[model samples]
Target: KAKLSLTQLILIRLSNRGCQTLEELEEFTQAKREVLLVTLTRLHQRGVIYRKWRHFSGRKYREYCLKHRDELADLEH
Candidate 1:
């Protein structure tokens, strides 16, 4: 009986486990990449998460992490 929105689910995971990459989030959430990307974009626009770029094996990816307390306080609705 535990149902949460994708947006909230993402926030909870990042808040508890720290930063997450797109692949990592898909593994944990079992959601499609495009769906997750859309949600992530919305959160970034709200200043809830900072998207950091990572370079590995000549490939680029994004890592998501929550912003400082003050920045996220506005989202506590």
Candidate 2:
């Protein structure tokens, strides 16, 4: 079973803003960039969020968003 903590909730809230970049999430959460990066990695592993790459300013940027909108979708029926 997956557990959601305050950090996770903050990460989820920041990521739910639709196509939020890592830097954006860091700024929003006021958490260290590295810490947020790790949290995001964990969230991705849990299938709670997804990442996508986009080219911006000649560099690839990662955007994060909810993997599934329905909370119940994460639970076994």
Candidate 3:
């Protein structure tokens, strides 16, 4: 199908929101953290998502979010 295997809900939720951590994604998608880890890395490698190191409550973690809408279309070029 020329597409990575990701759950529809996972893709939709990310498309709808941004700057979500693994834990937050688990909560929103109701998926296993372990599973989301693999899915997130896959998307990262595919260039569908990007990560940024952020600090909150004196805690540091990588937040993941979708890239600009037009960015993905560039892949076809």
Candidate 4:
């Protein structure tokens, strides 16, 4: 309820649910692609999640996964 921003909460929620593609996350969180991309980039920069390019159905997309234990615990707590 404090400190964490909305983007951070969504990222944490997304993390707990496992990794998701950009499109998947946009739909899952009902957030604009642009918004997610910015927050995702920030989170990536902070090392909260791991992102990578993946190809599926002849399409390439970026996916994110929460892999930082400290960050995860902080989110959960």
Q: TM-scores of the models, in the given order?
A: 0.75, 0.64, 0.70, 0.66
Against the unseen true structure, what C-alpha lDDT does each candidate score?
Answer: 0.76, 0.64, 0.68, 0.69
Worst 10 residues of 2 by lDDT: 68-77
Residue 20 lDDT in candidate 3? 67
| Candidate 4, pairs of clashing residues | none
Q: How would the candidate models be sorted by lDDT, starting from the highest? A: 1, 4, 3, 2
Q: What clash pairs does model 3 have?
A: none
- Model 2 per-residue lDDT tens digits across residues 8-37: 655567555655767766666666778777
Q: Give the per-residue Cα lDDT of candidate 3 at 57.
A: 86
lDDT of 4 at 74: 42
- Model 2 spans > 4 angstroms off: 1-16, 68-77
Give the per-residue lDDT digits (tens) of candidate 3, residues 1-77: 11433455567777778556777777776778888878877877887777666667898877777774434334422
**Cα RMSD to native, each candidate?**
6.5, 8.3, 7.6, 7.5
- Model 1 per-residue lDDT tens digits across residues 1-77: 03877787788888887688888888777888999889998888887877766677998777787774534433531
Tens-place lDDT per residue, model 4, 11-62, is 7677668676777776666778898788888877887776766667997766
lDDT of 2: 0.64
For model 3, where is the 10-residue window of minimal lDDT?
68-77
Report how far residue 74 has shifted in candidate 4, in Å: 26
